[PDB]
Design a protein around this nucleic acid. Structure first.
Length: 280
DNA sequence: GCACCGAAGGTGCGTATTCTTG
């Protein structure tokens, strides 16, 4: 799955609460950002502070409006893949998943644009450079093994005149449906090369064959809570509405109890084999 | 494309929609 969200001022904390971590992009490499992410410098980049002796971006933003600090492209991996990576503990699947993200974001990067006004007439220009902060997370709200990566695309791209202008967001936003598959297709290719058998269902989606549905929803409690949400309120999973579909975006909440993780994975392991799950 | 940002021109706005649920 590719979950997206355009990021504003209201979110800057939760945006920083995203710290395993890597930079990616032509926009990042030109600003000299390589290797892991620095929390102080990432928040500087969210806020508009590029540094390197240049002004602060998005000065020409209107004040009635929300200052959007970037775009969150979350690459959420299927359940069966999370279990073989987090419960079995396979680094190869962790490493396969990062590549699906990285190769998908390169196509997102190819779709980067910004606007240039020359004598009162705006021009759209495809820049093809992005400044992305990627953060690999391993759990979910109900702390089910849930591999997902936050691709924070910073609201900046360098133009051909050498300037840092805000990214034109459109052709990335309206390509989320495509990029969700590009992540599907890359990850499927990688697992297929590791010797893993895949079973298919719904949209191009797939699970490992040794992990059937029988033991998937056991680890999909967060989905059981979503499924029970609409079922309480007398409504189908499939015949929902856009926003009304996010009626579970929160309200299926739990307590974010900070827990030890070593004893959790042994819980995973025992909750796995209790479903007879064979990691083969 | 507009209407307000701010110092020239540049900007959010809106866009989005799988399931495993950010």
């Amino acid at each position: 799955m590719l979950s997206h969200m355009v990021l504003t001022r209201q979110d800057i904390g939760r945006a920083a609460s995203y710290y395993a971590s890597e930079w990616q992009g032509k926009g990042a490499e030109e600003l000299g950002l390589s290797g892991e992410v620095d929390s102080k410098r990432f928040r500087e980049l969210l806020a508009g502070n590029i540094g390197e002796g240049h002004r602060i971006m998005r000065s020409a933003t209107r004040q009635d409006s929300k200052e959007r600090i970037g775009l969150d492209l979350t690459f959420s991996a299927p359940k069966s893949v999370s279990l073989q990576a987090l419960v079995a503990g396979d680094a190869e699947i962790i490493k396969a998943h990062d590549r699906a993200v990285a190769r998908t974001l390169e196509q997102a990067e190819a779709r980067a644009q910004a606007r240039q006004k020359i004598q009162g007439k705006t021009r759209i220009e495809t820049t093809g450079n992005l400044v992305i902060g990627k953060f690999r997370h391993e759990t979910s709200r109900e702390r089910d093994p849930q591999l997902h990566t936050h691709a924070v695309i910073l609201n900046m791209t360098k133009r051909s005149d050498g300037q840092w202008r805000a990214l034109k967001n459109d052709e990335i936003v309206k390509a989320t449906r495509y990029l969700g598959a590009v992540y599907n297709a890359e990850l499927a290719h990688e697992l297929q090369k590791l010797g893993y058998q895949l079973r298919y269902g719904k949209d191009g989606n797939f699970d490992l064959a040794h992990i059937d549905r029988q033991q998937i929803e056991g680890f999909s409690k967060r989905t059981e809570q979503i499924a029970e949400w609409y079922a309480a309120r007398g409504l189908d999973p499939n015949s929902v509405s856009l926003e009304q579909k996010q009626a579970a975006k929160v309200l299926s909440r739990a307590k974010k109890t900070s827990v030890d993780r070593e004893a959790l994975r042994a819980e995973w392991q025992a909750t796995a084999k209790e479903l007879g799950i064979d990691f083969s």
